[PDB]
Amino acid sequence: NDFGRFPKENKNLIPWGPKKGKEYDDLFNAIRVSDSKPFDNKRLILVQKWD
């Protein structure tokens, strides 16, 4: 989206939301990702950032 002070993403490129008088066209409402069953704290470590 170049119509602005600095560029940003075009959120309307993949259509989402309801439209007035138009058929519902949300693709990523059809993809529904559930979360995980909780795992244990025995699987956790204390890593550090290296660049």
Q: Which residues contact RNA (rule: CB under 7 A)? A: 11, 14, 16-18, 26, 28-29, 31, 51
User: Which distant-in-sequence residues (6+ apart) come within 8 Å of 27 by Cβ?
Assistant: 14, 15, 16
Angstrom CA distances, 20 to 8, 10, 12, 17, 36, stand at 26, 20, 15, 10, 36
CB of 29 to RNA, least distance (A): 4
CB of 10 to RNA, least distance (A): 12
Judged by beta carbon, residue 8 or residue 14, the one nearer RNA is: 14
CB of 42 to RNA, least distance (A): 21
